[PDB]
Structure 1
Amino acid sequence: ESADLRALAKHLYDSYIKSFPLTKAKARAILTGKTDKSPFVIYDMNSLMMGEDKIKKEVAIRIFQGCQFRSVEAVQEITEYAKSIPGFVNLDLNDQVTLLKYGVHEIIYTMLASLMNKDGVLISEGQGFMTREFLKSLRKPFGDFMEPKFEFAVKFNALELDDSDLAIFIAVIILSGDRPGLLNVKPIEDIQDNLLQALELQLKLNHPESSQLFAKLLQKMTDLRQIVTEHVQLLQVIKKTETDMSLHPLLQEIYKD
């Protein structure tokens, strides 16, 4: 029944609004220019030093440390959203942990696209905007932590998904029965099946002119997994080069693999 799929799409959207304070709709209105919501822009070291006045160690390290703290808050938001996905909490506790461990970063890069356009990224709940050029201009190896995220984002954003869409897509990501170390693959796959059915109808209803959008979205999961693995490789470099740099426990446990 179509109607049970619609109801589940509605529930997931509602949870998504409750779990994530900065939605794509809000991010786009800020980026577009929809007076009231105008961000301060950080394109250089002086603008960055100014940003601390009107927005909420070393500069490159201060920035990277900021991202990692933000990434932790995002993991908490994603974690709260996951608990809302029907069946998730009823799964074996080790599998819940495993789904989260492999899922959360893919979800982070998916939603981070919402806060990006080709020249920059929203920061600090959208009060600030840090330019893409400025992030590139960071001393090695920090120069190119964000670049693969921009490249993914520009392309992902051409799909034109809205938040209702994304709510379902991120649920589909989390409930992937091919995560390494899963004890009970079957219960997970049965939930994903249902979520995939919900996503399929949603995209057909919400984007009736956009052909094979469902398949086009699913193929993007290939791009997400690539971004994760490259980011891990970059993180291994940093720890060795910046022996004075402190990585957040949560994030360390996630990356253990």
Structure 2
Amino acid sequence: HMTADLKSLAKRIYEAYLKNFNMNKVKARVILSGKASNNPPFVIHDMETLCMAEKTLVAKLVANGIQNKEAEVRIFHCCQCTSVETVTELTEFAKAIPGFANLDLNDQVTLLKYGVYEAIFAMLSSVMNKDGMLVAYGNGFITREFLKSLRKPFCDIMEPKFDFAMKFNALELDDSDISLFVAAIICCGDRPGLLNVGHIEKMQEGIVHVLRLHLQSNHPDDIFLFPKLLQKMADLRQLVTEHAQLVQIIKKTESDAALHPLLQEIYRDMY
């Protein structure tokens, strides 16, 4: 059962999550359901609407050397910028997890290096439905079919994330569940190269324990929701392993698809 120290751990993880992530599930579902506004996001569903959307982003695109690259390269330059922002928010989120900042700096780097994209793809589900995903802070909606329509290999990047997201979203998690889930992802004792594995495993056990009790209380009828989420954690590691492999393939065969430096150091020597 859930004692006071455990409720407090769950509360500060939930608060750290609401503070650090501009987009979260309650905000995304309000946009995607369109029940708070008859002004829906601009839909990007083909090359013409992409180019319309990019007339808005012109100064940013011209900021880098991106405005004249292939559409596939422009799209995933913007997706990278989003990833960079989320890594920055996840780093702040992690430092607020009790015990994370006490770790050796090397272990903090390792946890984030291997954790952020598992967390990214888990939280990405919040802004996805079967037909597309919210972009540009919820102001745009880029369709699944348009992403599938791009040329190889750029058309293979997102579809597995949609596939994960549809099954993940069927669990009906709310932000309080997701914050603990993401905290469990980050505080993973398995990561290659970790030094103080005993102490991280200890930290993970407490978070995963709170996750389990929180789920049993918040979703009492879904008896095996915790086992289901354990499996989703395994699925995310495999999702991320394959994503890293695709990023490596693109980095070798695509002269024009540069990697942001922060993501470059995340992917370097990953899997």
Distance 2:13 2:199 in 1: 19
CA gap 1:37/1:189 in 2 versus in 1, 3 angstroms: farther
Q: Which moved more, 1:104-113 or 1:202-211?
A: 202-211
CA gap 1:112/1:98 in 2 versus in 1, 3 angstroms: same
Distance 1:96 1:36 in 2: 44
Aligned to 2:160: 148
Partner amino acid for 2:19? Answer: K
Aligned to 1:163: 175
Aligned to 2:84: 72
Structure 1 gap segments, 5+ residues each: none
Aligned to 1:254: 266
Aligned to 1:16: 17
Cα displacement (A) at 1:244: 2.9
- What secondary structure does 2:126 align onto? helix
Distance 1:78 1:98 in 2: 13
Cα displacement (A) at 1:36: 5.5
Is 1:42 aligned with 2:54? Answer: no
Aligned to 1:33: 34
Distance 2:234 2:203 in 1: 21
Asked if 2 retains the 8 angstrom alpha-carbon contact of 1:117 and 1:154, the reply is: yes
Distance 2:256 2:33 in 1: 40
Cα displacement (A) at 1:53: 4.7
Structure 2 gap segments, 5+ residues each: 61-68
Distance 2:248 2:188 in 1: 26
Aligned to 2:64: none
Partner amino acid for 2:3? Answer: S
TM-score by length of 1: 0.96
Cα displacement (A) at 1:245: 2.4
- What secondary structure does 1:121 align onto? strand
Aligned to 1:199: 211
Distance 2:130 2:46 in 1: 17
Cα displacement (A) at 1:2: 2.1
Asked if 2 retains the 8 angstrom alpha-carbon contact of 1:43 and 1:130, the reply is: yes
Asked if 2 retains the 8 angstrom alpha-carbon contact of 1:23 and 1:163, the reply is: yes
How well do the aligned residues superpose, as a CA RMSD in angstroms? Answer: 1.4
Cα displacement (A) at 1:140: 1.1
Partner amino acid for 1:60? Answer: E
Runs (4+) of structure 1 exceeding 6 A deviation are none
Count of aligned positions = 257
Is 1:95 aligned with 2:107? Answer: yes
- What secondary structure does 1:130 align onto? strand
Aligned to 2:194: 182
Aligned to 1:208: 220
Write the deviation string for residues 9-33 of structure 1: whole angstroms up to 9, x where unpaired: 1111111000000011000111111
Cα displacement (A) at 1:230: 1.2
Q: Which moved more, 1:75-84 or 1:188-197?
A: 188-197
Partner amino acid for 1:12? Answer: I
Asked if 2 retains the 8 angstrom alpha-carbon contact of 1:40 and 1:54, the reply is: no
Q: Which moved more, 1:234-243 or 1:155-164?
A: 234-243
Asked if 2 retains the 8 angstrom alpha-carbon contact of 1:5 and 1:201, the reply is: no
Is 1:242 aligned with 2:254? Answer: yes
CA gap 1:183/1:33 in 2 versus in 1, 3 angstroms: same
Aligned to 1:217: 229
Cα displacement (A) at 1:54: 5.8
- What secondary structure does 2:87 align onto? helix
